[PDB]
Symmetry: C3
Subunit: 31 residues, 3 copies
């Protein structure tokens, strides 16, 4: 179970960092 969770969590961290960068661009009107 634990390694299953660790994989999912690392995958969410990536996805969430991607979402933060996109949303920061939309809020700041970048590019």
């Amino acid at each position: 179970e634990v390694e299953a969770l660790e994989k999912k969590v690392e995958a969410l961290e990536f996805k969430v960092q991607k979402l933060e960068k996109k949303v920061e661009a939309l809020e700041h009107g970048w590019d």
Copy 2:
């Protein structure tokens, strides 16, 4: 603890997939 985590993680996965779809719409100007 572990099942507590598994629930939270599955809940984040749902929420993150919802955020990806919304942000993809905003970036693409869908609809």
Copy 3:
């Protein structure tokens, strides 16, 4: 491992709630 995960998960929950609020503003044209 488990506490390492619990910290990361709580950190994602915060980050995801922040992203939900920002994206809801962008979708609703708030402010």
